[PDB]
Amino acid sequence: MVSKGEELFTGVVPILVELDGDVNGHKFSVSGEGEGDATYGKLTLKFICTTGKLPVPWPTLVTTFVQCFARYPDHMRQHDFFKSAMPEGYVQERTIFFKDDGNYKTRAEVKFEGDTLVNRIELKGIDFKEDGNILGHKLEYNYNSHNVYIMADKQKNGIKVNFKIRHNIEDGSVQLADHYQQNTPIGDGPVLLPDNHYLSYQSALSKDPNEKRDHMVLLEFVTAAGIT
Ligand SMILES: [Cl-]
Hints:
Layout: H1 4-7, E1 13-23, E2 26-37, E3 42-49, H2 81-84, E4 90-98, E5 103-113, E6 116-126, E7 146-153, E8 158-168, E9 174-185, E10 197-206, E11 215-225
Parallel strand pairs: 1-6
Antiparallel strand pairs: 1-2, 2-3, 3-11, 4-5, 4-9, 5-6, 7-8, 7-10, 8-9, 10-11
This protein binds chloride ion.
PDB class: halide binding protein
Keywords: beta barrel, luminescent protein, yellow fluorescent protein, imaging reagent, halide binding protein
Assembly: monomeric
């Protein structure tokens, strides 16, 4: 049978993202909108900085900016925590360590509000260098493909996730961002606790030629794998 969580994702779902951020005291807000099509693992989103100029590079926020839209193969359906927690939702927490620089800590609440999948995020960044690659804006506007590794965390009725992102720096080098993540259901109901597996991401960043506000257009495809 198809679960109630699965059923919510069988079509195209509107997405709303709202973030409040503070990185080394630079305060900013971002709003995002678009659509997710989980059957195809497809995300299409546009983000706008509503407070003026974004004080960090847009690529550093890509991972923060709805893993319930991942395409899970039929044979791996019993391993899809994210959809199983819906519609009541889940809280995602991350620490993201930028090598030789500062760190972000994020808390995101992801749930349905009517037909819209909403993610409300608070991001706090500290210990950044004033002329490091982040606050000095030295990162290229592009994105590499990566795998995201998932395991159950029974004691929390959720999952633990870890992965490394390599951001290309303008001089040809790379800025590593080590991600540690936990997700916990908001409701008290049963969720699917997965066997170890991963999600494969591909991402493309672009600009809306008619948009004068600071913004990012993101197209992402996400597929679960590792169990066959
Ligand atoms: Cl940027």
